Design an enzyme around this catalytic site. Sequence first.
Site, PDB file in Angstrom:
ATOM      1  N   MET B  13       0.818  -1.214   0.000  1.00 51.15           N
ATOM      2  CA  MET B  13       0.000   0.000   0.000  1.00 51.15           C
ATOM      3  C   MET B  13       0.854   1.267   0.000  1.00 51.15           C
ATOM      4  O   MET B  13       0.643   2.166  -0.822  1.00 51.15           O
ATOM      5  CB  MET B  13      -0.951   0.002   1.198  1.00 51.15           C
ATOM      6  CG  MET B  13      -1.843   1.238   1.191  1.00 51.15           C
ATOM      7  SD  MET B  13      -3.184   1.177   2.384  1.00 51.15           S
ATOM      8  CE  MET B  13      -2.277   1.022   3.925  1.00 51.15           C
ATOM      9  N   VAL B  14       1.787   1.390   0.952  1.00 48.78           N
ATOM     10  CA  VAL B  14       2.626   2.586   0.968  1.00 48.78           C
ATOM     11  C   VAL B  14       3.448   2.681  -0.310  1.00 48.78           C
ATOM     12  O   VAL B  14       3.567   3.757  -0.904  1.00 48.78           O
ATOM     13  CB  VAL B  14       3.510   2.621   2.223  1.00 48.78           C
ATOM     14  CG1 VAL B  14       4.544   3.735   2.090  1.00 48.78           C
ATOM     15  CG2 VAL B  14       2.620   2.881   3.467  1.00 48.78           C
ATOM     16  N   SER B  39       8.037 -12.297  -3.382  1.00 46.12           N
ATOM     17  CA  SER B  39       7.289 -13.491  -3.768  1.00 46.12           C
ATOM     18  C   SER B  39       7.259 -13.772  -5.264  1.00 46.12           C
ATOM     19  O   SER B  39       6.669 -14.781  -5.670  1.00 46.12           O
ATOM     20  CB  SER B  39       5.836 -13.400  -3.270  1.00 46.12           C
ATOM     21  OG  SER B  39       5.132 -12.342  -3.907  1.00 46.12           O
ATOM     22  N   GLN B  75       8.908  -1.969   2.317  1.00 52.13           N
ATOM     23  CA  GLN B  75       8.548  -3.350   2.613  1.00 52.13           C
ATOM     24  C   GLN B  75       8.202  -3.548   4.084  1.00 52.13           C
ATOM     25  O   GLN B  75       7.312  -4.342   4.409  1.00 52.13           O
ATOM     26  CB  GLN B  75       9.691  -4.281   2.198  1.00 52.13           C
ATOM     27  CG  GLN B  75       9.403  -5.774   2.381  1.00 52.13           C
ATOM     28  CD  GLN B  75       8.236  -6.275   1.557  1.00 52.13           C
ATOM     29  OE1 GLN B  75       7.831  -5.661   0.559  1.00 52.13           O
ATOM     30  NE2 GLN B  75       7.673  -7.395   1.982  1.00 52.13           N
ATOM     31  N   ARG B 104      15.047   4.357  12.710  1.00 57.58           N
ATOM     32  CA  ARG B 104      14.759   5.766  13.006  1.00 57.58           C
ATOM     33  C   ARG B 104      15.679   6.353  14.062  1.00 57.58           C
ATOM     34  O   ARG B 104      16.160   7.487  13.924  1.00 57.58           O
ATOM     35  CB  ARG B 104      13.306   5.931  13.471  1.00 57.58           C
ATOM     36  CG  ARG B 104      12.378   6.366  12.372  1.00 57.58           C
ATOM     37  CD  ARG B 104      10.925   6.425  12.842  1.00 57.58           C
ATOM     38  NE  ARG B 104      10.040   6.110  11.733  1.00 57.58           N
ATOM     39  CZ  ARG B 104       8.814   5.620  11.864  1.00 57.58           C
ATOM     40  NH1 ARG B 104       8.275   5.418  13.059  1.00 57.58           N
ATOM     41  NH2 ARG B 104       8.121   5.307  10.769  1.00 57.58           N
ATOM     42  N   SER B 167      -5.665   3.276   7.876  1.00 57.15           N
ATOM     43  CA  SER B 167      -4.548   3.028   6.965  1.00 57.15           C
ATOM     44  C   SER B 167      -3.225   2.875   7.703  1.00 57.15           C
ATOM     45  O   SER B 167      -2.318   2.190   7.208  1.00 57.15           O
ATOM     46  CB  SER B 167      -4.428   4.159   5.945  1.00 57.15           C
ATOM     47  OG  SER B 167      -4.161   5.378   6.615  1.00 57.15           O
ATOM     48  N   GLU B 243       3.172   3.864  19.973  1.00 55.99           N
ATOM     49  CA  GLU B 243       2.728   4.974  19.138  1.00 55.99           C
ATOM     50  C   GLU B 243       2.886   6.305  19.864  1.00 55.99           C
ATOM     51  O   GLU B 243       3.353   7.286  19.281  1.00 55.99           O
ATOM     52  CB  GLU B 243       1.272   4.763  18.716  1.00 55.99           C
ATOM     53  CG  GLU B 243       0.797   5.734  17.671  1.00 55.99           C
ATOM     54  CD  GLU B 243       1.281   5.349  16.269  1.00 55.99           C
ATOM     55  OE1 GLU B 243       1.974   4.310  16.117  1.00 55.99           O
ATOM     56  OE2 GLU B 243       0.986   6.094  15.318  1.00 55.99           O
ATOM     57  N   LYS B 246       6.585   7.409  20.240  1.00 54.10           N
ATOM     58  CA  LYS B 246       7.210   7.971  19.041  1.00 54.10           C
ATOM     59  C   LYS B 246       7.128   9.493  19.018  1.00 54.10           C
ATOM     60  O   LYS B 246       8.030  10.154  18.492  1.00 54.10           O
ATOM     61  CB  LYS B 246       6.554   7.389  17.789  1.00 54.10           C
ATOM     62  CG  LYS B 246       7.036   5.985  17.470  1.00 54.10           C
ATOM     63  CD  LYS B 246       6.139   5.320  16.437  1.00 54.10           C
ATOM     64  CE  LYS B 246       6.693   3.945  16.061  1.00 54.10           C
ATOM     65  NZ  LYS B 246       5.739   3.199  15.193  1.00 54.10           N
ATOM     66  N   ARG B 269      -7.407   5.068  17.873  1.00 52.87           N
ATOM     67  CA  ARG B 269      -7.843   4.688  16.538  1.00 52.87           C
ATOM     68  C   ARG B 269      -9.332   5.003  16.391  1.00 52.87           C
ATOM     69  O   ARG B 269     -10.122   4.688  17.288  1.00 52.87           O
ATOM     70  CB  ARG B 269      -7.585   3.194  16.306  1.00 52.87           C
ATOM     71  CG  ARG B 269      -7.869   2.731  14.881  1.00 52.87           C
ATOM     72  CD  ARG B 269      -6.668   2.984  13.972  1.00 52.87           C
ATOM     73  NE  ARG B 269      -5.502   2.200  14.367  1.00 52.87           N
ATOM     74  CZ  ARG B 269      -4.267   2.461  13.953  1.00 52.87           C
ATOM     75  NH1 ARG B 269      -4.012   3.477  13.141  1.00 52.87           N
ATOM     76  NH2 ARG B 269      -3.259   1.702  14.385  1.00 52.87           N
ATOM     77  N   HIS B 276      -5.216  11.032   9.573  1.00 52.39           N
ATOM     78  CA  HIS B 276      -5.049  11.201  11.014  1.00 52.39           C
ATOM     79  C   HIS B 276      -5.384  12.632  11.393  1.00 52.39           C
ATOM     80  O   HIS B 276      -4.957  13.578  10.720  1.00 52.39           O
ATOM     81  CB  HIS B 276      -3.610  10.951  11.464  1.00 52.39           C
ATOM     82  CG  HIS B 276      -3.148   9.533  11.341  1.00 52.39           C
ATOM     83  ND1 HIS B 276      -4.008   8.480  11.108  1.00 52.39           N
ATOM     84  CD2 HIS B 276      -1.908   8.997  11.429  1.00 52.39           C
ATOM     85  CE1 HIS B 276      -3.312   7.352  11.056  1.00 52.39           C
ATOM     86  NE2 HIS B 276      -2.035   7.641  11.236  1.00 52.39           N
TER      87      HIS B 276
END
Lengths: 373, 374
Positions: B13-14, B39, B75, B104, B167, B243, B246, B269, B276
């Site tokens: 997705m990203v 894969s 990935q 990070r 997401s 979360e 961070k 969430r 967000h």
Amino acid sequence: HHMKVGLVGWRGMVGSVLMQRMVEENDFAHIEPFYFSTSNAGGEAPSFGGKTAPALMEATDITSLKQMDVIITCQGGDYTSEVFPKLKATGWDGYWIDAASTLRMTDDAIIVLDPVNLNVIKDGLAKGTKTFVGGNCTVSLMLMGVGALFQNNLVEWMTAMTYQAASGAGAQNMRELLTGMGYLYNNTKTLLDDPKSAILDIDRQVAELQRGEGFPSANFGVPLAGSLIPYIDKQLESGQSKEEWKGQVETNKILGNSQIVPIDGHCVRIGAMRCHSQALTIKLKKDVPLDEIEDMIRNSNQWAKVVPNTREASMTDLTPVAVTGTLTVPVGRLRKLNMGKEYLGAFTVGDQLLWGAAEPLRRMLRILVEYKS
Amino acid sequence: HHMKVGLVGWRGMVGSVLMQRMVEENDFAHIEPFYFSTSNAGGEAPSFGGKTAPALMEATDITSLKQMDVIITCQGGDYTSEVFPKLKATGWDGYWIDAASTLRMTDDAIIVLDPVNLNVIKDGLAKGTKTFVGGNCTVSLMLMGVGALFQNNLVEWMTAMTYQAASGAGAQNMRELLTGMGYLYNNTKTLLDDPKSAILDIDRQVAELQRGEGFPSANFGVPLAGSLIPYIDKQLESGQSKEEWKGQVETNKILGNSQIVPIDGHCVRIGAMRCHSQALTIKLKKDVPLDEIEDMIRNSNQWAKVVPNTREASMTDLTPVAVTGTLTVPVGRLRKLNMGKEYLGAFTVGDQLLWGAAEPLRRMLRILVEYKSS
């Protein structure tokens, strides 16, 4: 002697919760109930609790209302604004118990949340106070959870960022939320039914549906399903919404504070049915140990519940799904924050229709019944 | 001359958002792209931007990766944890651009958000830094909106109460959110189709559906549709979630602060797809006039916008619906709070897949391309 109690707005959503709870709690046993109507006067009245009543009376008929010892109204602000000044002008010396905001901040009214301010209520009853009003849902739900910290004069200020459900706006708003949920799914399911459909295509379709003319947003004005709305109630000159303004004035009035504890934040609508949640930054006046904070909450009233600050308990017990339709008021994520030991984080969830609306009113009627006996 | 750029995780997705943005921005004109696969090694590679590439290479094959001048990977953390130490152990001197949180907080990595910290990036490139990592979606979106206040060293501390989209958890979580929305409506619509059905009946049925075994909650573990979840990612020893943790470490590392500005709050969430939102209590070091705060935000970068603090503007421009799939970062509800003129309230919304994920990575690639051509 049983008081003659006039029930107004008992058919609407809040009034219906009030009627259900009164029946459950045997509240009709020691009153003489009379039912009023704004569209069905003369029709057959309910017999809630096995107590029969005469034909429905006109809720706006001052001469009928004046025959009551107590009026308990869930009909709303337009009704109270019209009827209350005229009823009081007659000299009527009965009690008025109101869900609506109209009278909250008037000199002669007490805002009721008796697990927090029973003392204020009973003092007022003895002094001749006649008007008792439920507080705003967010304030009442917050105080049911963390009011002990305020009662112990521990709070210097608080900010509250809310996650408010559709029920606070009304039954039609709840139906619109669900209909919008269906609109998004049912118009995307041909993609969702293929496990290899592209998520970006699914997402593009949801956004198109939310932005399109077909999305049902008559009641909220903009979409709520799949979104949020960071503005609730009227705009004030300061830029605060009226919902946010209620936080400071109503909290301090319920507590009987003569010196204001500052309360502020953002009130935000999310797509939940009937539970409000609140994320609180609480600045304490001194470094209170966390375990003592937790014990104050536990000991404050039987409905507050401390949810352990763990991933598992937070996910199962500190949500609208855990709380909806119950009287439980969980408080969790309780933790001292990074900017210092006097900064307390908390997250709380409560049912808007119960502690946030109907429950303080039925408990006030019980307090009055016991007082008058 | 074009650097050889290895693309890993471009199908997820990203990475799909990255590929779309790179095509839109003609990012392939300046590189020689090579596509890797976990894969489908040996399969036909894409030709995004009209550039042909050889057959898909194995993303875990160190011998293939070390031929690249740059690796850009969406990935994820398990992949980086496996492959990055092996690749660097060969003496590979290339650039690593990563969406994942893994690197990070390592000494040798820079967290990239160039509208905010271009100077930190360009300094590192000249000092020899080779590893550049995207910041957490929450921190990046917050800094895109109110970062000017931190860059001007005006912030004493901040709490952030967040309203995070599905997401950030993944594509399957977004699909589960939508499927739960359908589950609630389609199993209540026989009541909803009667305008006089009892709202408390409808409500009772929704709650029963949410609590029953039939409710689809495999991915979140508990319902999200019609609810919220006040816990994101792993439980830390401190009682924060990962979360929430961070927030402070990444904000101060992006900015290059030596003195840590405290950042804390609750990460929650909610049932939104990919935007967000964050409700901020910002303690300023001094009484800055509101109009100057707004001007700082407006002028910080071309994507930050100040939404007037009115009911109409907040409802239409300061929501996931206004922002989703766009690069706009509105900041609104800007007002001094009741506890004093140094207390600023703010509410901001940002797209999680763009500034919160793919966009800093493609912009970092452009910075690197320009830098390596002098």
